């Protein structure tokens, strides 16, 4: 039905059949960060800087969740950030309660059913603040709020870097409660709050480096690095993305190598000689910036 | 000092130049998973397999050993191996088997002064025939007799994907006996065997994707894909990676991008637009093989 689509096709067709596709075949959980956020604005908007960012993540999520992706995990603030400026830090707190409590997003939530949860350390790096334990107070009561909706699920990344004795705790005081250890089930389901399979992809950008998305990474998390920050995100780049992870990543039937002709296996390893040296990943710096070669 | 070297300097350089220079800069961890061994085997050797792959692996280890990285990580084979034929099980623990019993290896070790230890669910998952308990019996046993070696560090991953069940255990019985919860430091300690810094870099090939270093990623990991398997990797390959990683990564000092001209973030803006739908991991498939484009 589905399993022959061609590139051409599947970028051609409306949003609603590549929506019912994914839905099918997946990717149905996607790790999609973003980052870059000041280069984009001085770069593709010089209104407001906090709005911008906000309406243009809105912009991509909708995009994610329309073209079929259950699940979305974004982390957007890492422990970095407690390491700069006081003016720095309230800026964070404050697009933090924009995820929670702007009316824009929170009828954007509503309109497209999703349930929104909050993964990572910040209960305990958040400053003890005012400012920052009203914002625990609105991400623990948005994803109350927001659990009854059933379409997508939105897991946003608040210092959710190493989950490690994050675990350990909870797998203590489950364990203490219950007399057995928990599952690999329940431990997923005490980090982000609820059970989240592992990503299917991961789509970052610049440098190649992932990152914010424990326990769900599993060498079938597919991996892609755009030139251009999150915020950038095409139609056709989505697509493509999304085509080759579903279509060429696990390509199927494989052929019975052993069977191959002389020429075939020939031309197989002069692809490999072809370039010896050949490696994605190494870059140049431009500006201060870093760019992938090849 | 060594802030400035030039990549063509870097290339040129002898090799105890270049591991002076990484044991002062880094990268500590390095992930090398060794795949694509019938692949490389069938065409770049096609005398006898196992001992190929055996030999090829301690060049490689070597290499990556000489040119001063400390730890090397290296995931050898994941659960996936277990739903394969029965030959080709018993075929996998002969290899496990060379890796902690072989002569020509355990010469290596001891040359170089390499400490081994192995991760993962393997005492759990190994068949519990008498070839999977000897397998296991020869893993502690070369992680003792190699404990005194200092020089450098092996990590090798048997079925090393998920860690979440394991730490979960680990810091029960942690609790259990200490009274409070284990730290960061002792959760990895406990995985590995022994504690290990967090990876600085990764290098796969083919599809853009890791796996099998559990704990050890950060999104300072920095990621590189070879074109061809494992094996290939010559020297060049290798320098231009420590180099990217080294120098390019990290690049500083950072620019005031508040304080560029107008022509300066107008360049920038159009690296960025040039090709606006421009992607690393998206591929083309040739022989069931994928190939990443661009
Ligand atoms: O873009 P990101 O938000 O990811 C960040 O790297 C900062 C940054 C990196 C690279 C370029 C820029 C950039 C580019 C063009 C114009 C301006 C930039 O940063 C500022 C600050 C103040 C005025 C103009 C610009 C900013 P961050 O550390 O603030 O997250
Ligand atoms: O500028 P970046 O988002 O790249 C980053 O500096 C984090 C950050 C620092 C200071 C302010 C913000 C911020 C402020 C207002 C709104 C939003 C912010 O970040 C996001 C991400 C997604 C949606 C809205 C906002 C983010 P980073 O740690 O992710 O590099
Ligand atoms: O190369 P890998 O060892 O990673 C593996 O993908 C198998 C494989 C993938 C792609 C190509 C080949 C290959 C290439 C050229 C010749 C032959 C190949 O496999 C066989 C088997 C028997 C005879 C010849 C070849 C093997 P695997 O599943 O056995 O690990
Ligand atoms: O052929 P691959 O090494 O790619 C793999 O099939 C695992 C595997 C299956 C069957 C046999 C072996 C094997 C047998 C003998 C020696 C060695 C093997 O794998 C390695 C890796 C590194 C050094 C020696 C050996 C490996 P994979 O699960 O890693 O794809
Ligand atoms: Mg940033
Ligand atoms: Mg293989």
């Given amino acids: 039905a589905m399993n022959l689509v061609s590139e051409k096709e599947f970028l051609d067709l409306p949003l609603v059949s ?35 960012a906000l309406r243009q993540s809105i ?8 073209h079929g992706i259950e ?13 700069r400026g006081d003016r720095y830090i ?3 707190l404050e697009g933090m309660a924009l995820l929670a409590n702007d009316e824009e997003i929170l009828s954007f939530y509503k309109e497209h059913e999703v349930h929104v949860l909050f993964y990572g350390d910040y209960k305990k790096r958040l400053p003890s603040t005012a ?21 997508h699920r939105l897991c946003f990344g608040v210092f959710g870097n190493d989950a490690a004795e994050s675990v350990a ?29 592992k990503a299917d992809m991961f789509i970052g950008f610049g440098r190649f480096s992932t990152f914010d998305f424990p326990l ?20 056709t780049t989505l697509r493509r993305i999304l085509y080759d992870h579903i279509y060429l990543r696990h ?29 994605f990943g190494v870059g140049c710096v431009h500006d201060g910036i870093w760019f992938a070669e090849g």
């Fill in 90 to 92: 309230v800026q964070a």
């Fill in 18 to 52: 590549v929506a019912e596709i994914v839905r099918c075949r997946g990717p149905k959980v996607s790790v999609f960060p973003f980052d870059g956020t000041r280069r984009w604005f001085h770069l593709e908007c010089n209104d407001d800087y906090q709005q911008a």
């Fill in 59 to 66: 912009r991509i999520l909708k995009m994610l969740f329309e």
């Fill in 251 to 279: 390509f199927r039937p494989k052929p019975d190598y052993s069977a191959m002709s002389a020429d075939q296996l020939n031309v197989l390893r002069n692809r490999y000689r072809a370039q010896p040296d050949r490696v």
């Fill in 71 to 83: 699940t979305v995990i974004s982390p957007i603030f890492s422990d970095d950030l407690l390491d």
């Fill in 131 to 151: 400012q920052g334990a009203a914002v625990v107070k609105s991400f623990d009561d948005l994803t109350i709020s927001t659990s009854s909706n059933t379409e």
């Fill in 169 to 197: 705790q909870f797998s203590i005081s489950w364990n203490e409660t219950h007399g057995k250890p928990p599952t690999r089930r329940e431990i997923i389901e005490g980090y982000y709050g609820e059970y989240v399979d």
């Fill in 216 to 235: 769900l990474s599993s060498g079938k998390t597919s991996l892609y690095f755009t030139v251009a920050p999150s915020y950038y995100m095409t139609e």
